Amino acid sequence: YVVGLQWMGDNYVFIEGDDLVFNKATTRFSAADLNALMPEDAFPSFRTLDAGRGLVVLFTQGGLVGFDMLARKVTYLFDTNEETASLDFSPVGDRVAYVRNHNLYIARGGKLGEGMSRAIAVTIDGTETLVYGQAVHQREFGIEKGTFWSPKGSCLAFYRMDQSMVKPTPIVDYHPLEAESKPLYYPMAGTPSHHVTVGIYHLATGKTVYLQTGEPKEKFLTNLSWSPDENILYVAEVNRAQNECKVNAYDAETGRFVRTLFVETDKHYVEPLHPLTFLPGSNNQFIWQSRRDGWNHLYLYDTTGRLIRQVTKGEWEVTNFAGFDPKGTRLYFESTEASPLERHFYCIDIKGGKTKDLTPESGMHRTQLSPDGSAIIDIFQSPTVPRKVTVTNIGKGSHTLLEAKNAMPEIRTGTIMAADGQTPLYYKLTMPLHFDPAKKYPVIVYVYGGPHAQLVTKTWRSSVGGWDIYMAQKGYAVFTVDSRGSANRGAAFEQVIHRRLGQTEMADQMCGVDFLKSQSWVDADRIGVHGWAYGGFMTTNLMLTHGDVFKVGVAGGPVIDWNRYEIMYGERYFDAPQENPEGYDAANLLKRAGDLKGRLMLIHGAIDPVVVWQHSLLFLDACVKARTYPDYYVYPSHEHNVMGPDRVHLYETITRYFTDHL
Amino acid sequence: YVVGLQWMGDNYVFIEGDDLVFNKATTRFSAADLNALMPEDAFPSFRTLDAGRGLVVLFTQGGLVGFDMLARKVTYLFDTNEETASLDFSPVGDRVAYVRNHNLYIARGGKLGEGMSRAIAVTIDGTETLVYGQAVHQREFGIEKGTFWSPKGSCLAFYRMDQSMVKPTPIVDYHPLEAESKPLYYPMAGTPSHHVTVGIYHLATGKTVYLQTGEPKEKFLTNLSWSPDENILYVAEVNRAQNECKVNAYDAETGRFVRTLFVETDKHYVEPLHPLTFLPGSNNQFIWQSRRDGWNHLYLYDTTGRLIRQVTKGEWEVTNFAGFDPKGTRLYFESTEASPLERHFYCIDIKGGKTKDLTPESGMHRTQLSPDGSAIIDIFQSPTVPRKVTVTNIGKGSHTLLEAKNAMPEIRTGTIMAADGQTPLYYKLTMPLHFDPAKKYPVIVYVYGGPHAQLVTKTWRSSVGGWDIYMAQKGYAVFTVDSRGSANRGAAFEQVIHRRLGQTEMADQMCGVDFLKSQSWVDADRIGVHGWAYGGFMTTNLMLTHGDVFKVGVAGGPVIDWNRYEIMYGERYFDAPQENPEGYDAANLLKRAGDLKGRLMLIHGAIDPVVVWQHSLLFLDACVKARTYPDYYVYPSHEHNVMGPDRVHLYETITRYFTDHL
């Protein structure tokens, strides 16, 4: 990454230590010039709010400074009471919503000099048991926050989560003299889910209204989408069985149910991940993403509920919807049409038809469509190309903004059949530094395998934070393969795992082993395995299932008993435990601890809210009574992943463990 | 141990599967004959209540059966509501006191056939924050329970512990679907102690009275001792500085303070461990144990507070007071007068003078003085003798009841100077199985080192649960040495550690190393260390202090930061942390985690209430940030020590760790 590249109206900006170089399709702006315009070394970090209007917000000791870049003027001063995590600025740019001590507030931006005004408390009965304005449903179904402003800043929609009926998991903080425990309302598979409702605060009247979403109370309220009109608030409702998704229209004034536009079901599960996105200047048509036909595509609906058409279609998937052209006759997006291993920015006619790849060079393309929808910033990188920024006037020439190119582990890539004998799996093989084919090196299988992830793509070097490359330097070869269940290969490719977590995944992973055994340089007796989270589940499951093949493994934050995983994610792929005993039992690693004959180290972050510590601890417990002997390590200060400098320590631990036992 | 040997009036009993063979100085009693006398394979286990009268209690599915052995008659039936842990039977043998759901109750024994009567609730406002009738002050100062009956069963004294001012430590139970947390009111060094008061329930009137023990509320109320008279209730009060012990007399009728018999102080700390024990048929004289002159001896006091004399005296210590002769002219006891490495049962004149060793054979003598104070059962064992039961009519011959004698690790014993160049330390050395002096074996130092313990004594084989012998079989030599601070060597020998925990102990332990380096067969580069609890503290401290000497270690339930150890024990030897910063800082292993260069494994029982889990977890945390790499293992179901079959697993883990890294 090189100094935050992005759009500012019709200018594409990027920093330069002390400078913020604005350019087009050219003029600087120093941290100094900026300070000159402030009230009270390099260029300060900031969050862009309105790329188009160039409005941004600067974080500074005491309040936030709204600042306009295209007009170099300080917009407003906001006082959030030192709360930044939940900051959600009104689209009008003059107000910001945030959560503080369980409640939702709206601080009004104060003009420079004109004085500040007391923030407004939208709610006042918030609690650790009653959460307001924050992510809900375990951050599934695209939910990343809990506040939603109406297009015109007239209303502020927000979640209200009653989790008082959820038996909590303790999260211990071991730093105080005496350790302190805070409860974590983590709803486990099969247990009563939390109860969510959507409230709507009207800035004008200060009046609040909750959508009459009805019963059952556990209904999953996802993807809130306001109407450009602000009269309707759309909600993508999903049932507990997660096999039905009703998109409903709600009266934002009264909260009354208006009607169901459309419903979509699926044999295994439906999983809405994006809001409705209306066409520019339209209040009757909107684009909706669906994976209904086995591939995520863009559909053009009409607020009546009538499907006008499926804009994109094919055995590939849209991996990001960037938007439209000013008129709204073309849709821009990122997809795997070129290859499951690549990402290209496209552009298709709103009427459908052929798509035009705008970033055809083989590799990974991460593109940013400009505001005026004309130009395009493109950051590319392939196995051969480290990076290559390319601002482009859609139509004109493609002025390159930056190009680069660089003993190291040889990385090989190939394909192999999955355990079904027909499905093509992709793998990346990191050869040991100073590889000598005369030799017989030890190999470690790095594995995730779970849904929503794809590890093998045409990128630059590693795609696992460089752990593979680290290990390769210590003499071990690392191998990864996106087994069935992995992402971006279509619904059929993924859903095969339904109700049978771990089964096909391992069957496919063993095909990755056969491949490795086919290499002369592969020492079939020194095969290891490593993984985190879902990869932890796999690493352990593999060692207990194929104790003869894998000698050593290290499993971080491993899911051991899926009955203890969250309702939302867990139930989608496994279904409730009461309705699928055999599936759950086959994956309950606690039941097969006695099969641990090799050397395995579980690693966990004590205050982990994703995969509760209990998982790895209970495994150890099962081992004590089954008389098996795993190893262990705990990071008391970390949650799910060890981030920051501590990661040097994590890598050192994981690595040394293999150099010690593999 | 061979079928519970003990006294029953003038008979010495011991079981025999289905039989209970009574004998003298002879007749059986079958489990069958017994069942014939019950209301509703071998001989049932039982708790003796009155050895003299032969009264016992049998635990049987539904209630407890009081039974008389010397008269083969069922005394009473007790209904405790399935509560056994706290059972404390009235000396009258017809009533039992017990705690159930925070409250104290007294169930009356019901005669066979005559019907049962509803138990009486002495208290009713008990809580997890207000504990009634249980051990207090962290089970220090001899406190093992919280109920004390008056000699005639007229009154029931009991502790009332208000711990609401103690910040609790969580104890997580990871077995339920979602882990559950119960608070543990573990008062850490320097924090507010709990508030204890002694209540007295009068069976006759049902009236209750609390001793007016006054202020400060943190006063340690220890060693409650009733007067044979039942009018006075004696209490050994200890201050927070633990340098003063006032023995006070209290009116059992009103609870009013009567007077202070005597006070005893000490430069470092005073530590009362036994109640007052009046002379038979006397209400004015009682024996009191003190270590006031640097050695635990028996003192003869007068209820006025006047010291009549010091019955026993010498540079040895009384290790157990068995009692007197019917008349009360001789005291019987166990001591180290023969040698700190042995235990002999003695007998001295109440007037003082020479002591007569009644069990002179060199070794460990565990004796039981008969009720009529004439005979004596003696279980002996030495390095050469496995066991040797010996019933003896004090004066007559010594009829032996059982004698026994048996490739194995050669155990050597010797002495070495402590780091002060003058004090004699004793060690036990377990040689590796199949020792060959031509060789150079690796050695592991097993260490406790803390106060109140003595590992090196003239016993049979190991004296560490056989772990030394286990390791010796896998090629490693194990060495232990009772360093200064260890028990039974006098106050001066122990107190040297005061305010400087870990310092002299290690200095002495390194003298044990020099000794080992003096052996040709000792491979000076393969020296390890193992310890539990205080031994964990030592093991870690040694590896961080002498990283060059110790290559590998395993520390179970280790105290790492003494600021997190209980007030009672901790403050006695270290004094408060606020008054001894340097002492505490020098022992705060968290401060020196960066010095861990060798391989160390901490082991802990998750629900450990002695050494809170936090200790080892924080150490790991300190290591992550100091960039050092220890190993780890947790037993989620265990407390301080892994007992039962699981101990096979513990031993296997500890051992394999050394065979892997040492």
From Swiss-Prot, chains A, B:
EC number: 3.4.14.12
One GO molecular-function entry: dipeptidyl-peptidase activity
Processing and modification events after translation: The N-terminus is blocked.
Reaction equation(s) it catalyzes: Hydrolysis of Xaa-Xaa-Pro-|-Yaa- releasing the N-terminal tripeptide of a peptide with Pro as the third residue (position P1) and where Yaa is not proline
Temperature-activity profile: Stable for at least 12 hours at 25 or 37 degrees Celsius (at pH 7.6).
InterPro entries: AB_hydrolase_fold, Peptidase_S9_cat, Peptidase_S9B_N, Serine_Prot_S9B/DPPIV
Regulation of catalytic or functional activity: Strongly inhibited by diisopropyl fluorophosphate and Pefabloc. Weakly inhibited by 3,4-dichloroisocumarin. Not inhibited by phenylmethylsulfonyl fluoride, leupeptin, antipain or prolinal. Activated by iodoacetamide.
Activity-pH dependence: Optimum pH is 6-8.
Catalytic machinery residues: 533 (charge relay system), 608 (charge relay system), 640 (charge relay system)
Swiss-Prot/TrEMBL keywords: Aminopeptidase, Hydrolase, Protease, Serine protease, Signal
Family, as annotated: Belongs to the peptidase S9B family.
Function: Serine proteinase. Releases tripeptides from the free amino terminus of proteins. Has a requirement for Pro in the P1 position, but is inactivated by Pro in the P1' position.
Name by which UniProt lists this protein: Prolyl tripeptidyl peptidase
Recorded name of the encoding gene: ptpA
